[PDB]
Write a protein that binds this ligand. Structure first.
Ligand SMILES: CC(=O)N[C@@H]1[C@@H](O)[C@H](O[C@@H]2O[C@H](CO[C@]3(C(=O)O)C[C@H](O)[C@@H](NC(C)=O)[C@H]([C@H](O)[C@H](O)CO)O3)[C@H](O)[C@H](O)[C@H]2O)[C@@H](CO)O[C@H]1O
Ligand SMILES: CC(=O)N[C@@H]1[C@@H](O)[C@H](O[C@@H]2O[C@H](CO[C@]3(C(=O)O)C[C@H](O)[C@@H](NC(C)=O)[C@H]([C@H](O)[C@H](O)CO)O3)[C@H](O)[C@H](O)[C@H]2O)[C@@H](CO)O[C@H]1O
Ligand SMILES: CC(=O)N[C@@H]1[C@@H](O)[C@H](O[C@@H]2O[C@H](CO[C@]3(C(=O)O)C[C@H](O)[C@@H](NC(C)=O)[C@H]([C@H](O)[C@H](O)CO)O3)[C@H](O)[C@H](O)[C@H]2O)[C@@H](CO)O[C@H]1O
Ligand SMILES: *[C@@H]1O[C@H](CO)[C@@H](O)[C@H](O)[C@H]1NC(C)=O
Ligand SMILES: *[C@@H]1O[C@H](CO)[C@@H](O)[C@H](O)[C@H]1NC(C)=O
Ligand SMILES: *[C@@H]1O[C@H](CO)[C@@H](O)[C@H](O)[C@H]1NC(C)=O
Ligand SMILES: *[C@@H]1O[C@H](CO)[C@@H](O)[C@H](O)[C@H]1NC(C)=O
Ligand SMILES: *[C@@H]1O[C@H](CO)[C@@H](O)[C@H](O)[C@H]1NC(C)=O
Ligand SMILES: *[C@@H]1O[C@H](CO)[C@@H](O)[C@H](O)[C@H]1NC(C)=O
Ligand SMILES: *[C@@H]1O[C@H](CO)[C@@H](O)[C@H](O)[C@H]1NC(C)=O
Ligand SMILES: *[C@@H]1O[C@H](CO)[C@@H](O)[C@H](O)[C@H]1NC(C)=O
Ligand SMILES: *[C@@H]1O[C@H](CO)[C@@H](O)[C@H](O)[C@H]1NC(C)=O
Lengths: 163, 322, 322, 163, 320, 163
C-alpha cells in the first residue's frame, strides 16, 4: 500500500477486532483485549459512504437509449442512430468502470493512510515512555493500567507523569 | 511480561474481490455490488398500468382494423406497446402505409385512443361500400379492414364524391384513408368505371392529390393489386375534405387522442406476464435498488442506468489479510 | 524557558467552500470559481456587427417579401439572425415553403445577401402581373409578396411563358418562385384560362415540373387556395429557365449571396439591446473570463464552454481551520 | 488528510502567517515570530497554477450545440438530434464536475503532503539536538539564536556543532 | 559500517506530463501513439481494393464507356473513389437514392454481373440509342448495362416485360427514364406524346412520368436521364410496362459476397503493398494501441485520437 | 513527490544501480556495492505493467467513425452526422489524454512511496543499533559484515543480538 501500514509494517489484520476498521490491542496486568478507535473508524465510514453516494449521483444524468424505427431506404440514418446510441452507451460504460477502478484504489490507500495516522497518533503521545517494536506495537517502560491504556486511545496520555 | 499496546486493523473471512488499475482480484473485508444483473423474464404492468400487447398484429394492422386484429378494436389505456419483430397480421390487402415510422413515433407519446365513427358505411348512397377481398379473411369469408371502406361503382357509375368531416371534438383526431392501385385498365373500369381518377384531400394544412398507379405486380396474399394508406392529425375545429372519382378507400372510424404521456413501442417475442413492475425491458422486468443494470439498453419506468459491464463492484472495506 | 520552533500552515478568514468525492462543503483558504452564471439579458452586436432582428417576420416572410415585412427589403450585413418562436408575418397567402429547413440551414452560413431584379414586371406584355389577395393586406387593402409576382390571364388568354435568367454575377444566387393551388376548376379558368397547366424549371442541376392541385381546403387567412414556394441556388454562369401555361408565381427579385461566414438563427422574444458583446446567447450576452458557463447551450462568438452545472469551484488553497 | 499533518498532528493553521502557505513559528529570548517557507510555498503555487491551467486546456476542445430545425414529419430525426446534443452536454458536464471533485481531493492532499515533508525536513536536520513534542513543534535542548533559526529555514543546520 | 537506500537514475531524456507538471524527465517511458503511415493504398490482408480511378460508383455500375476497365471487377476489400471523378453520368442527370445505394455497397465485397434482358429481345423497338455525351473512343455511344429504346417504324408499342430472379443471390437491378427537351423531341424519339414507366415487384410500386423542361447543356445535352435501382430478392419478379422514355435494363448484378467494406474518398492510387490497417491517406503497420493518422480506417487498427502526443511514465523521475 | 523520498530526503538517484529500480548501497570493512531490492522492484513492475494494460483494455471499445454520404438537400443531417462523429472523437481524445496525465502522476508517486516504504523497512528493523543520517542512510554502531548486510535485505535482522 502507498502508506506502508496495511500488509506492511503491520503484517496482518485482526479477526479479533469485530468492532471497527482500525484500533488497538492492549495487554497489561489486568488482562488484554481489542478496542476499535472510534474517531478514525467513524471518519472512514463517513468518507467511504460519501464516496459511494457521490459515484452514484454523478452518473444520475446518464444517456438513455430510445427505440426508433427506420424504413428500408433510411439505412444511412438508421446506422447513424445506432452508432450514436452505442457511442454513448460505450462512453458511460467506460466512465462507470474507470471511476470504480480509480476509486477502489483510493479507498484501499485511504484505509492504509488511516492506519498509519493512527499509529503515529499513538507514537507521538508515548515518545520515550515506550519502545517502538517495529510491528505496530509499543512496549511500555512503565506499567500502564486500564485507565492509562484508555488515555492512550482518548489521546489524553500524560507524558510528564511517567518519564 | 512488560505491558504493551498495539495498533492494527480489521480482518475477517471475506473472499469478496474488487479490481483496481494496478491490481485485479484484490480480497477485501467489505465490498458493494452496484450492478443489477437479473430480471424476471416477463412483460408486466408498469406501475399498475397494463401494456398493449399486440400479439400477432402490427400497429398498421391494429389501426386500420385488419379483421385478424379485432381483439384491438377499442383498446383500453396502455403504459407501453409491445410488437413482435415481424407480426403476421399487418396489411392483409397488400401495399404500404405512408410515413409509417413517423406515425409510430407519435404513438410513443400517446397512451389512449377513443375510436369514433366519422363517416358511416350506410351513408354512401351512390356507391357500393361493401368491397371485400380474400386477402383479408374473417371467419373464412372474404372481408376487409374495419376502420376504412372500399368504395366501388354502382350501376356502372362512380359519381364524384364530396365529403367533409369537421372535428367538433376537443381532442386531436387521427384520420386514415387510402388509395387502391389496380392491376390493369380492365380492372379499373370494372371496379370504378372511370378510367382516369384521383383522390384529393384537404385540411387547413394538408393539400393532397393522389392518382392511382395501374401496373402488373407480383401476387402478395393472392393479390397483385395494392392499397396505399395515408394519415393526418385533424385539429379541433378543422375539417377534412375528400373529393374523388375513383380508387378511394374512405375512412369509417377515426381515433381521438384522449391521453398523451410517456410510452414506447418495444419489440419483443414475449407474452403478457400477469405481473406489475416499475422498470420494464423487452426481455424482462427489473426490481432492484442497484444504481446500474446490464439487462437491456431499452427500458421504460424508474430504472437503474444501463451499462455494458459484466461486473461493477466498489471496495468499501480494506484489503483482507489471508 | 526552553526555545521552540514549530512547523505550521496558513489559515485566514476565508469562508469559501469546495467539494471532493469523500467530503462536501470543505472550507478552504483560497478557491477559484470557474463557472460564469450571469448574462446581461440583452441581444447585442457581435464584435461590432449588428444582428438581423426580424421582429415579427419569419425568414419566409422576409425573403418572399410579405408586405408587413418591408422593414427588411434590403437589410445590411448581419452577425446573427433573430426570429421569434411564432412570427406573425410569415406566408400571408397560406401554403408552404418547400425544403424550408434546408434553406434556413444555408442561412446559417451566410452574413449578407444583395437583392437584385432578375425578371422585371415590364416583361409581362401578354399577362396581368398585379394579382393581390386580402390574405396579404397592406395598409388595410389587398396586396402581395414584393419579390415574386402573381401572373394571371389577359384578354381571356394565358400564352405559354418562357423566361431565362443567366447568372452573370460572380456570386451564387438564391432564386425563389411558386405555384398557386386553386380551389376549383371554375377558379382555374377564371384566373389562368388553361384548365390543365404546369410549371417547368431547369438549370444545370434542377429538373422540375410542377402541376397544381385542386382540392377543397379549410380557409386560412380567408383563403382556401394555397401557394407552394420553391427555391434553388443558381451558380455563376449557369442559367434558369421557366416555362408555364398557368398557376405560376414568378420571380421578380433574387438574392446574390455576397458574404459567407459564421452565423446562426436564434429563436428569441427579445428585442435589440443597443449593446455590444463578444459572446451572444438567445437569452442574453456573456462577458466573462470564466472558462465555463451555464447560461444557455446555444451561443455564437468567443464563448466559455457550456455546462449544465449549477456550481464549479476549484480548491487552490488548503483546508482552513476555524 | 492522507498525510496526517494538516488538521492532524498539527492541529490547526496560523492566522499569523499571512506571508505564505507553509512555514515556521519560532521562540527565542530575542523574540517570537512567523516565517513562511518560500521554496515549498512556491513549488505549491506552481503545481496548483499548472493544475488549473491543465483542467481548462483539456476542456478547451469540447462539444458545441448548433440550432437545427425540423418539420412536422421529421420528428424522429429531431428527437435523434435532441438526444445527441443533450447526450454530449451531459457527458461534458459530468467530465467537468467529476474532474473538479477529483482534483480538489488531490489538491488538499497535496498541501497536506507539503506540510509533512517540511516538518520532516526540519526533523531530519535536528535529530538529537531537539525534542519531538508531537504537536508540530521541536523543543530545543540548546539555545537557538536568531542566526541558528535561519540556518534551519535555509536547510543549513550544522548538527555536529550543537551535539 | 554504512547501508544506504536509493533508487535508479540513468542517462534518459524521455519526458512525460502530469496534471501539475509538464516535461518531467523519467528513467523509462512508453509511447502509446502511432504517428506514422506508409502513404499508400494497400491490399487489406491479401485482398486488393477496387480503385475506381477517374470513375464514380455510378459510372461503374451503369457502364459509362470511359469506365470499361470495371466491366467485371474481381472481389474487393474496400473501394476507393475520388472526390470529383470525371467519369460519372456521361449522359447528364441523376441517380435516385444514390447515397442509400452507396451505403449498401459498404457491406458488399463482390458482384457478379449478368445479363437479364438481352438486346435481341427488343423486336418492336430500336435498341441502339447513343449520344455524343457518352463517347467511346471519341464516338457516340451509351452506358453498357442499360439500353436506350426508341420508336421503330414510327411506332412505340407498349412494352411489357418480366424478369424472375431465379438466382440464389439478391440482384441489383438498374433502369432509367429520359427527360427530353421538348414535345417535338418526344414524338421524334418515342412517337407517343404522353408516356409512363411503371415498375413493380413484391415491394416496389412505381410509376414514373417524364418531364419536358428547358435546361442548361451539360456534356452538350439539355436532355436528362434519371436512373433508379432496387434489390430483387431470390424468387421475386420485376415487371416493367412503358409506352416511352424507358432506359431499360440489360445487365444487373448478383450480390455474391457480403462482408465488411467501405468507400474511401482518396486521390491516391494503388501502392502495390499489403497491410492489416488502411486509411485514406495511407496504411498503418503498428503495435501501438492508439494512432492519430486519420479517423476513417478499415482492418485491424489502433484506436484513433486527435492527440499529437501520448506517453505513459513507467520508470521514475530522473534527477540530473 | 507526495512521499518526500525521491528528490527529497534522498537527494538524487544512482547511476550505479543498473540491476533494479530501488535498492541498497552498503559499505563495510570487506567492501562496497549496489544491490537491488528484488521484492519492491518486482512489485513495481507488476503494478506498472498492469496499469498500462488496464489503460489499453478500457479504451478497447471506443468510437469508430464511418464514412456516410449525403446529398445537396441533406445538409442538416450531414452536419448532424459530422458533429456526432467529431463529438465522440473529442470525448475519446479527452479520455485518453486525461487518463495518461492522471496515471503518470500516480505512477511517479508510486515509485516515491516504494522508496519511502523500503527506507522505513530498514529503519524499523534497526532502531537503536544504527544512527539515522537523514540523507537516506544508516551509520551502524556495531560493525556489519557482508552477512548481516544480506539479512537486513532479506528482512531477517535479529535486533537483540546487536544492542
Ligand atoms: C366470383 C368470385 O369473386 N370468386 C372468388 C374468387 O375471386 C377467389 O379467388 C381469388 O380472387 C382474387 C381476386 O378477387 C377479388 C378478391 O381480392 O377477393 C374478389 C373481390 O370481390 C374483389 N373486390 C372488389 C371490391 O372488387 C377483389 C378486387 O377486385 C381486386 O383485389 C382488385 O385488385 O378481387 C385473386 O385473383 C386471388 O388470386 C384468388 O385466390 C376465390 C378464392 O378466394 O373465392 C371466390 O369466392
Ligand atoms: C370579392 C372580390 O373579388 N374581391 C374583394 C375580396 O378580396 C374581399 O373578400 C375576400 O375575398 C377573398 C377571395 O378574393 C380574392 C382574394 O384572395 O382576396 C380576390 C383577389 O383579387 C384574387 N386575386 C387574384 C390574383 O385572382 C383572389 C384569388 O382569386 C384567390 O385567392 C385564388 O384562390 O381572390 C376570400 O374569399 C376572403 O375570404 C374574402 O374576405 C372583399 C373585402 O374583404 O372585397 C372584395 O371586393
Ligand atoms: C445529324 C446529327 O445527329 N449529327 C450529330 C450531332 O447530333 C452531334 O451534335 C450534338 O447533337 C446533340 C443531339 O444529338 C444526339 C446526341 O445526344 O448526341 C444524337 C443522338 O443520336 C440522339 N440519340 C437518340 C437515341 O435519340 C440524341 C437524343 O435525341 C438527345 O440526346 C435527346 O435529348 O441526340 C446535341 O444537340 C449536342 O449539343 C450536339 O453537340 C455531333 C457532335 O459530335 O455529331 C453529329 O454526328
Ligand atoms: C464467514 O463467516 C460467516 C459467519 O459470520 C459465515 O456465514 C460464512 O459462511 C463464513 N464463510 C465461509 C465459511 O466460507
Ligand atoms: C480472478 O481473475 C482471473 C483472471 O484475472 C479470472 O479468470 C477469474 O475468474 C477471477 N475470479 C475467480 C477465479 O474467482
Ligand atoms: C367546424 O365547426 C364550427 C361550427 O360548429 C366552425 O366554427 C368551424 O369553422 C368549422 N371548421 C371548419 C374548418 O369549417
Ligand atoms: C478578510 O481578511 C482580509 C485581509 O486579510 C480583509 O481584506 C477582508 O476585509 C476580511 N473580510 C472579512 C469579512 O473579515
Ligand atoms: C452545504 O451542503 C449542504 C448539503 O450537504 C447544502 O444544503 C448547503 O446549502 C451547502 N452550503 C452552501 C451551498 O453554501
Ligand atoms: C450564360 O452566359 C455566359 C456569358 O456569355 C455564357 O458563357 C454561358 O454559357 C451562359 N450559360 C448558359 C447556361 O446559358
Ligand atoms: C466586460 O466587463 C468588464 C468589467 O466590467 C468591462 O470593463 C469590459 O469592457 C467588458 N468587456 C466587453 C467585451 O464588453
Ligand atoms: C517542453 O515543453 C515546452 C513547453 O512547455 C515545449 O515547447 C517543448 O517542446 C518541450 N521540450 C522540448 C525538449 O522541446
Ligand atoms: C419466380 O419463379 C419461381 C420458380 O418458378 C416461382 O415459384 C415464383 O412464383 C416466381 N415469382 C413470381 C413473383 O412470380
Amino acid at each position: 500500500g502507498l502508506f506502508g501500514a496495511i500488509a506492511g509494517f503491520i503484517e496482518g489484520g485482526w479477526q479479533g477486532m469485530v468492532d471497527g476498521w482500525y484500533g488497538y490491542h492492549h495487554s497489561n496486568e489486568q488482562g488484554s483485549g481489542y478496542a476499535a478507535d472510534k474517531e478514525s473508524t467513524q471518519k472512514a465510514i463517513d468518507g467511504v459512504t460519501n464516496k459511494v453516494n457521490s459515484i452514484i449521483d454523478k452518473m444520475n444524468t446518464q444517456f438513455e437509449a430510445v427505440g426508433r424505427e427506420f424504413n428500408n431506404l433510411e439505412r444511412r440514418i438508421e446506422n447513424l442512430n445506432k452508432k450514436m446510441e452505442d457511442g454513448f452507451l460505450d462512453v458511460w460504460t467506460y466512465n462507470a468502470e474507470l471511476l470504480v477502478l480509480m476509486e477502489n484504489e483510493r479507498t484501499l490507500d485511504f484505509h492504509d493512510s488511516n492506519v498509519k495516522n493512527l499509529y503515529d497518533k499513538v507514537r507521538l503521545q508515548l515518545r520515550d515512555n515506550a519502545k517502538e517494536l517495529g510491528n505496530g506495537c509499543f512496549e511500555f517502560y512503565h506499567r500502564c493500567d486500564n485507565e492509562c491504556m484508555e488515555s492512550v486511545r482518548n489521546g489524553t496520555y500524560d507524558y510528564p507523569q511517567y518519564s | 511480561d512488560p505491558d504493551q499496546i498495539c495498533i492494527g486493523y480489521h480482518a475477517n473471512n471475506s473472499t469478496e474481490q474488487v479490481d483496481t488499475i494496478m491490481e485485479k482480484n484484490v480480497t477485501v473485508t467489505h465490498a458493494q455490488d452496484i450492478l443489477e444483473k437479473t430480471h424476471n423474464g416477463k412483460l408486466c404492468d408498469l406501475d399498475g398500468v397494463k401494456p398493449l400487447i399486440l400479439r400477432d398484429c402490427s400497429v398498421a394492422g391494429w389501426l386500420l382494423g385488419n379483421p385478424m386484429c379485432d381483439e384491438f378494436l377499442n383498446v383500453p389505456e396502455w403504459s407501453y406497446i409491445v410488437e413482435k419483430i415481424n407480426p403476421a397480421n399487418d396489411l392483409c390487402y397488400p401495399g404500404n402505409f405512408n410515413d409509417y415510422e413517423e406515425l409510430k413515433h407519435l404513438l410513443s407519446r400517446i397512451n389512449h385512443f377513443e375510436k369514433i365513427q366519422i363517416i358511416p358505411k350506410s351513408s354512401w348512397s351512390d356507391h357500393e361500400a361493401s368491397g371485400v377481398s380474400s386477402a383479408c379473411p374473417y371467419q373464412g369469408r372474404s372481408s376487409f379492414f374495419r376502420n376504412v371502406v372500399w368504395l366501388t361503382k354502382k350501376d356502372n357509375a362512380y359519381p364524384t364524391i364530396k365529403r367533409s368531416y369537421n372535428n367538433t371534438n376537443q381532442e386531436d383526431l387521427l384520420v386514415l384513408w387510402g388509395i387502391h392501385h389496380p392491376n390493369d385498365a380492365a380492372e379499373q373500369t370494372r371496379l370504378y368505371q372511370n378510367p382516369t381518377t384521383y383522390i384529393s384531400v384537404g385540411t387547413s394544412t394538408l393539400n393532397q392529390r393522389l392518382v392511382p398507379k395501374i401496373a402488373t405486380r407480383s401476387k402478395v396474399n393472392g393479390q397483385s393489386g395494392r392499397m396505399e394508406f395515408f394519415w393526418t392529425i385533424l385539429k379541433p375545429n378543422d375539417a377534412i375534405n375528400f373529393e374523388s372519382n375513383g380508387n378511394f378507400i374512405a375512412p369509417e372510424n377515426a381515433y381521438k387522442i384522449v391521453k398523451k404521456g410517456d410510452s414506447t413501442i418495444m419489440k419483443s417475442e414475449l407474452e403478457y406476464g400477469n405481473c406489475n413492475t416499475k422498470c420494464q425491458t423487452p426481455i424482462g422486468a427489473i426490481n432492484s435498488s442497484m444504481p446500474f443494470h446490464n439487462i437491456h439498453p431499452l427500458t421504460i419506468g424508474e430504472c437503474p442506468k444501463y451499462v455494458k459491464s459484466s461486473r461493477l463492484v466498489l471496495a468499501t472495506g480494506l484489503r483482507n489479510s489471508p
